[PDB]
């Protein structure tokens, strides 16, 4: 199916306690593969997945340069945004950036992303056409003008459509045995009496990949609405993911309930009964 590549950088100012801390992480789909922490001693983009280790000194140099270069511009962007907003140098501010590209089933370009957030809210973003910018506010509009006069756009568009999808194609091939595997969920149900007239039913989905999954409870084939409790899909810590839905059930009624799990890695969607 479709795939993605993403970079997530975050700078935080530590006023009176040194220079800002820059952290950047890289993902193909739901699989991190690189990192750069400015408070690290390597001072280099480091690998975080096996299939990226096979990249040569040339690659690591290039990527190290671009992230280190970014960290520096960011640290000066935190300064500029203090001026733009007339903010106090006593307060700590955050500057996030996400960048990446979506591709289709055979590796064609679908969408490109380059956008920013100041203190957790939208700052400036590249519209879908990769031709224009959207500015969240008056400050971001100053930088919208600067990137317009600088013609940043036509550079980002060429990179996203080419280099970015070319790179994703490559990673998907080098990380083939992993980035394209589809692990189905290990499913099962539990039972917890809460107070003699009520018992929680809990449906489980474990060790699957990718993270996209649907858990559906039912009472006589009738979807429940939030009498059920979903938990946010969580990372197992080993490349796979987990999730569970629960319902509170009137004692003796347990068997009226069914669980319904849909996942890419399944042939047919499973249904479970206590």
């Amino acid at each position: 199916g479709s795939h993605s590549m993403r970079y997530f950088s975050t700078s935080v100012s530590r006023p009176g306690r040194g220079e800002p801390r820059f952290i950047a992480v890289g993902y193909v789909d739901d699989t991190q593969f690189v990192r750069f922490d400015s408070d690290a001693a390597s001072q280099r983009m480091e690998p975080r997945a096996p299939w990226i280790e096979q990249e040569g000194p040339e690659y690591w140099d290039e990527e190290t340069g671009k992230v280190k270069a970014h960290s520096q511009t960011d640290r000066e962007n935190l300064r500029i945004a203090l001026r733009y907003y007339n903010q106090s140098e006593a307060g700590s501010h955050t500057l996030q950036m996400m960048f990446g590209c979506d591709v289709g089933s055979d590796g064609r370009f679908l969408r490109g992303y380059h956008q920013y957030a100041y203190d957790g809210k939208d700052y400036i973003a590249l519209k879908e056409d990769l031709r224009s910018w959207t500015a969240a506010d008056m400050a971001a509009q100053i930088t919208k003008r600067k990137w317009e006069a600088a013609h940043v756009a036509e550079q980002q568009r060429a990179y996203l459509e080419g280099t970015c999808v070319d790179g994703l194609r490559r990673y998907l091939e080098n990380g083939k045995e992993t980035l394209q595997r589809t692990d189905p969920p290990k499913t099962h149900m539990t039972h917890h009496p809460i107070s003699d007239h009520e018992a929680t039913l809990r449906c489980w989905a474990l060790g699957f990949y990718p993270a996209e999954i649907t858990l559906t409870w039912q009472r006589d084939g009738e979807d429940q609405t939030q009498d059920t409790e979903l938990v946010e899909t969580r990372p197992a810590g080993d490349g796979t993911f987990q999730k569970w839905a629960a319902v509170v059930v009137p004692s003796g009624e347990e068997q009226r309930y069914t669980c319904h799990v849909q996942h890419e890695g399944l042939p047919k969607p499973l249904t479970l009964r206590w």
Binding site: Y7, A24, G26, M45, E62, E63, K66, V67, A69, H70, T73, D74, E76, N77, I80, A81, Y84, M97, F99, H114, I124, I142, T143, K146, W147, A150, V152, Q155, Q156, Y159, T163, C164, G167
Partner: peptide, 8 residues
């Protein structure tokens, strides 16, 4: 492949 970045 890490992106290029620009000043605000």
């Amino acid at each position: 492949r890490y992106p290029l970045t620009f000043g605000w």
